[PDB]
Curated annotation (Swiss-Prot), chain A:
GO biological process, one term: DNA-templated transcription
Subunit (UniProt): Component of the RNA polymerase V complex.
Descriptive protein name: DNA-directed RNA polymerase V subunit 5A
Gene: NRPE5A
UniProt-annotated location(s): Nucleus
UniProtKB/Swiss-Prot annotation, chain B:
Stated name of the protein: DNA-directed RNA polymerases II, IV and V subunit 9A
PANTHER family registered for this protein in UniProt: DNA-DIRECTED RNA POLYMERASE, DNA-DIRECTED RNA POLYMERASE II SUBUNIT RPB9
Zinc finger (TFIIS-type): 56-97
UniProt keyword terms in alphabetical order: DNA-directed RNA polymerase, Metal-binding, Nucleus, Transcription, Zinc, Zinc-finger
Compartment(s) where it occurs, according to its Swiss-Prot or TrEMBL record: Nucleus, Nucleolus
Record family assignment: Belongs to the archaeal RpoM/eukaryotic RPA12/RPB9/RPC11 RNA polymerase family.
Residues binding Zn(2+) 1: 6, 9, 28, 31
SMART domains, per the entry: RPOL9, ZnF_C2C2
Curated annotation (Swiss-Prot), chain C:
Name of the gene: NRPE1
Protein name per its UniProtKB record: DNA-directed RNA polymerase V subunit 1
Origin: domain of life: Eukaryota
Known tissue expression: Mostly expressed in flowers, and, to a lower extent, in leaves. Present in sperm cells.
Description of its domains: WG/GW repeats are involved in AGO4 binding.
Quaternary structure, from the entry: Component of the RNA polymerase V complex. Interacts with NRPD4, NRPD2A, and (via C-terminus) with AGO4. Interacts with SUVH2.
Coiled-coil blocks: none
Disruption phenotype: Blocked in the perpetuation of CNN, CG and CNG methylation in repeated endogenous DNA accompanied by a reduction in 24-nt siRNAs. Reduction of heterochromatin association into chromocenters, coincident with losses in cytosine methylation at pericentromeric 5S gene clusters and AtSN1 retroelements. Impaired RNA-directed DNA methylation-dependent (RdDM) silencing. Defective in the maintenance of post-transcriptional RNA silencing.
Subcellular localization: Nucleus, Nucleolus
Organism: Arabidopsis thaliana
Family: Belongs to the RNA polymerase beta' chain family.
Region of interest (Bridging helix), ranges: 276-288
From Swiss-Prot, chain D:
Residues of the full protein shown: 125 to 802 of 1172
Binding-site positions, Mg(2+): 620
Signal sequence, start to end: none
Role this protein plays: DNA-dependent RNA polymerase catalyzes the transcription of DNA into RNA using the four ribonucleoside triphosphates as substrates. Second largest component of RNA polymerases IV and V which mediate short-interfering RNAs (siRNA) accumulation and subsequent RNA-directed DNA methylation-dependent (RdDM) transcriptional gene silencing (TGS) of endogenous repeated sequences, including transposable elements. Proposed to contribute to the polymerase catalytic activity and forms the polymerase active center together with the largest subunit.
Main location: nucleus
Protein name as catalogued: DNA-directed RNA polymerases IV and V subunit 2
E.C. number(s) listed in UniProt: 2.7.7.6
Family from the record: Belongs to the RNA polymerase beta chain family.
Domain of life the protein comes from: Eukaryota
DNA sequence: CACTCTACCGATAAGCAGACATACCTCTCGACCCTGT
RNA sequence: AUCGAGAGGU
């Protein structure tokens, strides 16, 4: 069983896995991206890009189904430690380019709290990720129970049966995986259903708070 | 390391490289004597230096012990990555490979 | 009449007594009774016995049986239907006989009687059955004589031969690993079961001692023959010198033969004479038990205090949901399972459960630690670990440690999976220059050019790892990195250290004439700045350091890790599938660990591990490699996965220590953990975070 | 309600240019006592046949000394963690520690090698500097005095280099008096200078046992060779726990010490007061007796004796009220030993000396231990044996540093090299032969350590010893009644201490010995004597669980009610309890048979029939005839 | 003699009882007191040395 | 469009002292010092 | 009456 250790740069495999997981995350987000683009494999990416990765080709885009201004994106701009000026420059580029400005801005390394203060300068929300936090996808795990989120007409029918507000419902913090992987603003219960075969119908309506 | 003493005063000899003669000499700091024996001024020191895997299905002679240490290594006779089973030596001392 | 149903184990707390079970067994051994004897027992019954079982025979006339006595002891009308016994109006139909199933059968009987009619009927049944059974035995008598503790010299020689056969692996126990120790424990358990089967042939020991209980078997075998092992290396209460340089010298001074493997293989028993060395070892073991027991009684008290200072305000309201007294917060939506099964439990609206769960969680721990059980020690420790986890933690050993599963081979070739397991280690070990060094030399070279330094480091031929002269390559890149970094102050002579180079030409042998070794594989790293020997000496001591230490990257390795070992585990504990295996195959699962590179934020113990292994596609991304901890699944997956990993581990530990099921209490505790925004234990900082997040104004609790 | 005391009077002689100093308490049955006096004056004058002595009456309360166990101070203690060898001694001035270490104070970082330095009078002096100061002449000589024989190449070349660099620090360590002065400067520039010339301090506080300086140096040699051999791994660090490295201090050193503390207070008061008179009467006015008296008493009462090492702290656990509940509680209260604080566990040196089975259970588990039946502690032998040793061949350690020490083995008495001997095996033999012909002290222990080439002879106080039968004399003397002394003398028995024992090959019993006579040198008198007084009498003690026999020998034996006192009128204790009709057991242990004392067993023989009786006997309850309890049994 | 490390053997203990006249293994036939009928199980009976503790019941009750 | 130079926020260790002996309950046996009128 | 210490059954 001679392991065909990839003599290609590990950065290439890292970038491929990160882009694949990001495209699947956006597919889960309910955005229209061509499934043929998601179907790209490691060998295809190696044939197109080679074995040495390039930080010049980073364009990813998406669109909403029924909205008029909702289009989030991913740019792997980070390859070394950067400043607030770099994020400001890329934001100005996408601001003078088009209106889809709201996007994910992943970073290859640790983030600074000054950037977290600077995201408020942009009139939209972003999601600082890592280049290693997108190397192994979630929701494709044999231990993750499927999470379903309701809309504010049948979830609103929780005051009918329970007659309880979201504060007394079991909380979830907006820093875990399945809360920062789908996109959840306060005011929607995550009707967790336990598909663990040992777990019975322990639905808890664990909402975000 | 090598240890030498002044013939005249039985004192520690310090190494000194003569740039003129391009040869190493040993001279005592305390008094006045020098010479060379082997030109081997050494900083000699003995730099100080595990069974992680184990098998459960290797065939034994008679009792089915199924105990051995399996690990991938390269043999000196045939180059290449090959499983090297460290047998428990039930009836033979030679290590067998798969 | 109301606390019969236990909120801890779920079954009746009125368990069976020793005399009761003994009397019932010696009464069921004789199915038919006499006339006067049968009449004298019924007297203590409740109603008369009109119909006799055996009307007429050859020599006996009216003869009754124990079944009708149990019937007249039973209530008036009842219908158990427990797949083994049928009753219809105080009329028992069949009653099975076994070795220990009678207790479970009568327990099912009394539970059915309680759930059918009520508690008063069960109390009357017990009050009518106890004196009857006490009287039954009293006539018969039970006692143990010296014949019951028969040695059976033939079986004794058989046991001695088994001991001689089993003492051979004793030499390789305390040296290789703990897996051989577990195999030794299994073999000792097998020999103990054999001795118990050879011992329970008597009439009184089989009726007085339990069979399914392991503690009873141990306490019976240890007092008749083949005293168990009493010197182990797992206990940290005593010092290792006592078994490294004391027992061997004692056995060599006192015994004739060497017998180095005579530590817990004592042949004497309690019925026969005990050697003075055996008595010494037994007293050492008894002292270890006593100190462990005292700690087991001392520390879990503080643990119970800590977990009780927080679970005193969890009470369900009239709405059916679990509410809190402060800020009217909700913990759970309903106390009680809502599965396909339905039972009218004793849990009501205005009943406190947080205190109940606190006591029901402090009880199993107490037992596990009061006894000196090493099997229960590991189980107790895991529970203790889950009870001390904190919101803020730094570089703990558990978080860095990560399990590492694999993917089954498509080919299915024998050992293909194992081939993969050994291979992946090779990309996660950390071999370093040091390991490979064996000597250190410095010679003087004759003579612009001026370079008189040839380390000849002399690494051993460990070409099994296969590292190439590519050692030179990592040394070159490391010295280039060190020289390029100019922000550090007071650095070594990097401008002159660039002359290091490795060359193996089978002709560099210039060692001293003493020894006549003539080895190979030299190392010619040299750095020159001047000619005086003092500068050469001091420079050498500084740079020597970077090589054997820093050159970890040289062979077969990644840094940011210590090593990788393969551990076999049962897959049924982490996942439940429809095509699960027997969990007995020799499948090996790796356990990486991280080397103070967990200094990274929160836990990147994972982030570090997924990064190193990026050149192996055998790693499966479903049924993920989960970190063996509680707080790292909070960052890897959502809060639901942490909840699941907590409840499963608590349930497994409770099932290992005790038998009662407390799934509802475990779920309640795991939900009580998820209130302040992060999974927090029951400690001082956790209580402060709880009082700050939920706005608890209770200075009295913190003052106590 | 008064202290049986005794007045201590000294002759003082104040001259300007037999007073009473205090009262020590006496121990019943001691030489001072009037009850030991002569022949029994009167059984009737109160005495109970049962009572034996060993207690002090302090203010109407009998009190006893639990012996305390302390570390030997007569041997070099190598410690592995900081790599130090030490010559601990009691006078603080005397302690000298040579300690290897990666020193970052003046030397380089961890890349450098470790170096050997000493610690004397709160100073940091290199070793080679010292050797020179004590008279070593050349570096070669010194190396011989630290004759690491082994070649562990890595360690030696490091120590050598580092040592030589710490020496050059001083301008002329090798030649002249500069090394000595270096030392002098250092000792004087310390926080509390001795203020005594270096040359007297080298003789005075550095190795007081030895006389010459050169000799003192050779000893610095042995002291380093050990730290070195240990680092190389040939010899092993000392275990605090093993008894061979411990001494038991009974009621002599504990009384000596508290008086020393107190005598001092008095001398200080006297002087202060005398000053007032001297500036600008009977001697008695000046010295206050109360000081010793009151002080000793306060200690006995409040039970806070002085700390052995720290000088202003009070240890507790030295005195304890004797318990008179049964006759045996008293016997086991006078044989207890303690270790103030792997120490909570048995050890293999506690064999024959302390009991492996019994111990308190509770906080003091393990720490308080009980002596064995046949164990005798030793007392300082006043006679000095050096001369005698010389008679058997032993040659003086040569003063000159130069001499070779070709093959002699060192002989060390109570920790001081006193001689060199040639064929150790022969020497030890002759010495032993003398011990057994009664020409040398009985309690002297001769140990020949083949590995380190030394004979160590000890004759100090505190060493636990026990008797043991010897083989050849057993063969032809017994054959061709005995008081103990006659036996010890003609050498058919002997007292062998813990270290010497390690050398001995002792057979477990007479039968075992008989099977193979040649291989065994000594034979134990009886395996039952390895336990305490309260454990060696239990029938089938090795047939029960360890916890069970521990409980029975610690609490059930003390709480047993029988046999309280022969004269019961002269005693007014708070509770006493006496059996109406006490009985002896039917079975005979050897130990009871020898001791010939009957208060050992407190109880009555009861015919038991294990059985179940109507369920009143379940779960450890006891059911008893109401007519044996009325015909008199168990009435108190 | 029952000295702690040189106890009489079990074979010796039991070949004494036999010579005495009691059953080799130490048990004896017992007839029930209340009824007079022989009882089926032989009972083990012998003389043991018991002790009384100082912790009496009367002081405890309060 | 490159350079240097010190004011300011982090992360760092890094050193500094403390702090702790589950709980119900029983019994007995001793408890501050120097100086002036 | 108070305090502290020691020895205990759980
Ligand atoms: Zn010289």
């Amino acid at each position: 069983l001679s392991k065909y250790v990839d003599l290609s740069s590990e950065e290439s495999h890292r970038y491929y896995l990160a882009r694949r997981n990001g495209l699947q995350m956006l597919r889960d987000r309910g955005y229209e991206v061509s499934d043929e683009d998601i179907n790209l494999s490691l060998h295809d990416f190696r044939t197109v890009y080679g074995e040495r990765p390039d930080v010049d080709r980073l364009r990813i885009s998406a669109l909403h189904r029924s909205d008029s201004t909702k289009k989030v994106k991913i740019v792997f701009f980070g390859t070394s430690m950067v400043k607030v000026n770099a994020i400001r420059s890329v934001v100005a580029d996408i601001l003078s380019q088009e209106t889809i400005t709201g996007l994910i801005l992943v970073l290859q390394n640790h983030v600074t709290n000054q950037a977290l203060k600077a995201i408020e300068l942009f009139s939209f929300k972003v999601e600082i990720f890592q280049i290693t936090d997108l190397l192994v996808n979630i929701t494709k795990h044999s231990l993750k129970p499927q999470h379903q989120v309701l809309n504010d007409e049948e979830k609103t029918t929780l005051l009918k049966k329970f007659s309880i507000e979201e504060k007394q419902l079991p909380r979830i913090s907006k820093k875990d995986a399945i809360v920062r992987y789908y996109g959840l603003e306060k005011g929607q219960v995550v009707k967790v259903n336990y598909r663990g075969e040992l777990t019975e119908s322990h639905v808890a309506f664990r909402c975000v708070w | 390391s090598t240890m030498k003493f002044c013939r005249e005063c039985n004192n520690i000899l310090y190494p000194k490289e003569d740039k003129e003669q391009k040869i190493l000499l040993y001279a005592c700091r305390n008094c006045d004597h020098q010479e060379v024996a082997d030109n081997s001024c050494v900083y000699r020191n003995e730099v100080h230096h595990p069974t992680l895997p184990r098998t459960k299905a290797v065939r034994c002679s008679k009792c089915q012990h199924r105990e051995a240490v399996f690990f991938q290594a390269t043999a000196r006779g045939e180059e290449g990555m090959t499983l090297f089973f460290v047998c428990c030596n039930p009836n033979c001392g030679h290590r067998w490979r798969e | 009449e109301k606390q019969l149903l236990s909120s801890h184990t779920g079954q009746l707390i009125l368990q069976m007594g020793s005399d009761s079970l003994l009397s019932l067994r010696v009464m069921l051994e004789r199915v038919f009774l006499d006339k006067a004897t049968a009449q004298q027992l019924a007297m203590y019954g409740s109603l008369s016995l009109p119909p006799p079982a055996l009307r007429k025979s050859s020599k006996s006339g009216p003869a009754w049986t124990v079944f009708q006595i149990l019937q007249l002891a039973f209530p008036e009308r009842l219908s158990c239907k427990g797949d083994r016994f049928l009753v219809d109006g105080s009329d028992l139909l069949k009653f099975d006989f076994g070795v220990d199933a009678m207790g479970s059968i009568i327990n099912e009987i009394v539970t059915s009687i309680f759930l059918e009619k009520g508690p008063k009927e069960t109390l009357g049944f017990f009050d009518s059955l106890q004196p009857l059974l006490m009287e039954s035995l009293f006539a018969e008598g039970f006692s143990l004589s010296l014949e019951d503790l028969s040695m059976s010299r033939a079986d004794m020689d058989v046991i001695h031969n088994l001991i001689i056969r089993e003492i051979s692996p004793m030499v390789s126990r305390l040296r290789l690993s703990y897996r051989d120790e577990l195999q030794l424990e299994n073999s000792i358990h097998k020999v103990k079961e054999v001795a118990a089967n050879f011992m329970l042939k008597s009439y009184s020991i089989r009726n007085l001692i339990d069979i399914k209980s392991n503690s009873a078997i141990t306490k019976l075998v240890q007092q008749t023959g083949f005293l168990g092992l009493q010197l182990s290396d797992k206990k940290k209460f005593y010092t290792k010198t006592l078994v490294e340089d004391m027992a061997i010298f004692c056995k060599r001074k006192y015994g004739r033969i060497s017998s180095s493997g005579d530590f817990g293989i004592v042949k004497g028993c309690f019925f026969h004479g005990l050697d003075p060395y055996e008595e010494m070892a037994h007293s050492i073991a008894a002292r270890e038990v006593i100190v462990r027991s005292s700690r087991g009684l001392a520390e879990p008290g503080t643990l119970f205090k800590n977990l009780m200072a927080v679970l005193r305000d969890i009470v369900i309201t009239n709405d059916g949901t679990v509410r809190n007294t402060c800020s009217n917060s909700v913990i759970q939506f309903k106390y009680g399972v809502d599965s396909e099964r339905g039972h009218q439990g004793l849990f009501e609206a205005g009943e406190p459960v947080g205190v109940l769960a606190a006591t029901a969680m402090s009880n199993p721990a107490y037992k596990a630690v009061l006894d000196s059980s090493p099997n229960s020690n590991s189980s107790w420790e895991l529970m203790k670990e889950v009870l001390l986890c904190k919101v803020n933690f730094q570089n703990t050993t558990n978080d860095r440690r990560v399990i590492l599963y694999l993917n089954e081979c498509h080919c299915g070739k024998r050992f293909c999976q194992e081939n993969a397991a050994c291979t992946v280690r090779n990309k996660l070990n950390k071999v370093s220059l040091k390991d490979t060094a064996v000597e250190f030399l410095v010679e003087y070279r004759k003579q612009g050019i001026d370079s008189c330094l040839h380390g000849h480091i002399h690494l051993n031929k460990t070409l099994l790892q296969d590292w190439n002269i590519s050692m030179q390559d990592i040394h070159q890149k490391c010295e280039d990195v060190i020289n390029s970094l100019g922000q550090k102050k007071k650095k070594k002579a990097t401008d002159d250290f660039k002359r290091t180079s490795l060359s193996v030409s089978e002709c560099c042998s210039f060692r001293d004439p003493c020894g006549s070794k003539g080895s190979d594989m030299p190392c010619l790293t040299f750095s020159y700045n001047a000619t005086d020997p003092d500068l050469e000496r001091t420079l050498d001591v500084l740079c020597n350091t970077v090589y054997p230490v820093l050159l970890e990257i040289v062979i077969k390795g990644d840094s940011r890790i210590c090593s990788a070992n393969i551990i076999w585990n049962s897959s049924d504990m982490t996942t439940w599938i429809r095509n699960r295996h027997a969990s007995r195959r020799g499948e090996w699962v790796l356990d990486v660990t991280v080397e103070k590179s967990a200094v990274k934020q929160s836990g990147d113990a994972w982030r570090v591990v997924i990064d190193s292994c990026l050149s192996v596609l055998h790693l499966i991304d479903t049924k993920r490699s989960i970190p063996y901890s509680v707080k790292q699944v909070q960052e890897l997956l959502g809060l639901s996965c942490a909840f699941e990993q907590a409840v499963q581990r608590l349930s497994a530990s409770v099932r290992m220590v005790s038998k009662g099921v407390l799934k509802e209490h475990i779920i309640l505790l795991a939900n009580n953990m998820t209130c302040s925004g992060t999974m927090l234990g029951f400690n001082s900082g956790g209580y402060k975070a709880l009082t700050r997040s939920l706005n608890i104004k209770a200075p009295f609790t913190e003052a106590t | 309600n008064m202290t049986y005391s005794a007045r201590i009077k000294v002759n003082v002689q104040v001259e300007v240019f037999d007073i009473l100093i205090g009262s020590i308490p006496v121990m019943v049955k001691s030489i001072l006592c009037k009850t030991s006096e002569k022949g029994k004056e009167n059984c009737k004058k109160g005495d109970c046949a049962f009572d034996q002595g060993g207690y002090f009456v302090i203010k109407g309360a009998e009190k006893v000394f639990i012996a305390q166990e302390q570390m030997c101070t007569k041997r070099l203690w190598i410690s592995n963690s900081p790599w130090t060898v030490s010559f601990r001694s009691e006078n603080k001035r005397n302690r000298f520690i040579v300690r290897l270490s990666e020193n970052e104070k003046a030397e380089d970082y961890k890349r450098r090698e470790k170096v050997l330095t000493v610690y004397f009078l709160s100073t940091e002096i290199p070793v080679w500097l010292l050797f020179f100061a004590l008279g070593v002449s050349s570096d070669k000589e010194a190396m011989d005095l630290i004759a690491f024989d082994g070649d562990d190449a890595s360690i030696t070349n490091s120590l050598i280099a580092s040592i030589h660099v710490a020496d050059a620090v001083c301008e002329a360590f090798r030649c002249g008096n500069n090394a000595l002065t270096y030392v002098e400067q250092q000792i004087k520039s310390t926080k509390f200078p001795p203020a005594e010339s270096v040359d007297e301090c080298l003789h005075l506080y550095l190795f007081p046992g030895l006389q010459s300086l050169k000799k003192k140096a050779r000893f610095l040699g042995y002291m380093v060779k050990c730290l070195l051999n240990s680092y190389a791994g040939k010899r092993k660090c000392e275990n605090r726990d093993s008894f061979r490295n411990k001494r038991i201090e009974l009621a002599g050193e504990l009384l000596e010490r508290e008086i020393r503390v107190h005598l001092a207070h008095a001398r200080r008061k006297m002087t202060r007061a005398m000053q007032k008179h001297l500036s600008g009467k009977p001697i008695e006015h000046y010295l206050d007796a109360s000081v010793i008296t009151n002080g000793l008493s306060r200690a006995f009462s409040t039970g806070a004796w002085s700390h052995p090492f720290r000088k202003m702290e009070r240890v507790s656990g030295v005195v304890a009220n004797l318990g008179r509940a049964n006759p045996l509680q008293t016997l086991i209260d006078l044989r207890r030993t303690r270790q103030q604080v792997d120490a909570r566990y048995p050890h293999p040196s506690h064999w024959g000396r302390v009991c492996f089975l019994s111990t308190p259970d509770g906080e003091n588990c393990g720490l308080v231990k009980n002596m064995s039946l046949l164990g005798l502690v030793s007392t300082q032998s006043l006679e000095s044996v050096v001369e005698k040793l010389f008679a058997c061949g032993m040659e003086e350690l040569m003063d000159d540093t130069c001499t070779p020490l070709f093959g002699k083995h060192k002989v060390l008495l109570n920790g001081d090299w006193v001689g060199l001997c040639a064929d150790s095996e022969s020497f030890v033999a002759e010495l032993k032969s003398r011990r057994r012909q009664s020409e040398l002290p009985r309690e002297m222990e001769i140990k020949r350590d083949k590995d380190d080439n030394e004979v160590r002879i000890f004759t100090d106080a505190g060493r636990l010893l026990r008797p043991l039968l010897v083989v050849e004399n057993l063969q032809k003397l017994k054959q061709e009644q005995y008081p103990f002394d006659h036996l010890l003398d003609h050498g058919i028995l002997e007292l062998i201490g813990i270290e010497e024992e390690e050398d001995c090959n002792t057979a477990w019993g007479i039968k075992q010995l008989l099977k193979e006579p040649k291989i065994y040198t000594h034979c134990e008198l009886d395996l039952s004597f390895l336990l305490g007084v309260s454990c060696a009498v239990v029938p089938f003690a090795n047939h029960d669980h360890g916890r069970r026999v521990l409980y029975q020998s610690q609490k059930h034996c003390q709480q047993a009610i029988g046999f309280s006192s022969t004269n019961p009128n002269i005693r007014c204790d708070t509770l006493s309890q006496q059996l109406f009709y006490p009985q002896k057991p039917l079975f005979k242990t050897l130990a009871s048979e020898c001791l010939k004392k009957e208060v050992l067993f407190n109880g009555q023989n009861a015919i038991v029939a294990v059985n179940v009786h109507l369920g009143y006997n379940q779960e450890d309850s006891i059911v008893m005839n109401k007519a044996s309890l009325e015909r008199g049994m168990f009435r108190s | 003699h029952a000295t702690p490390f040189s106890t009489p053997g079990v074979t010796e203990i039991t070949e004494q009882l036999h010579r005495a006249g009691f059953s080799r293994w130490g048990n004896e036939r017992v007839y029930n007191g209340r009824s007079g009928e022989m009882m089926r199980s032989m009972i083990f009976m012998g003389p043991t040395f018991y002790q009384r503790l100082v912790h009496m019941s009367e002081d405890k009750v309060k």
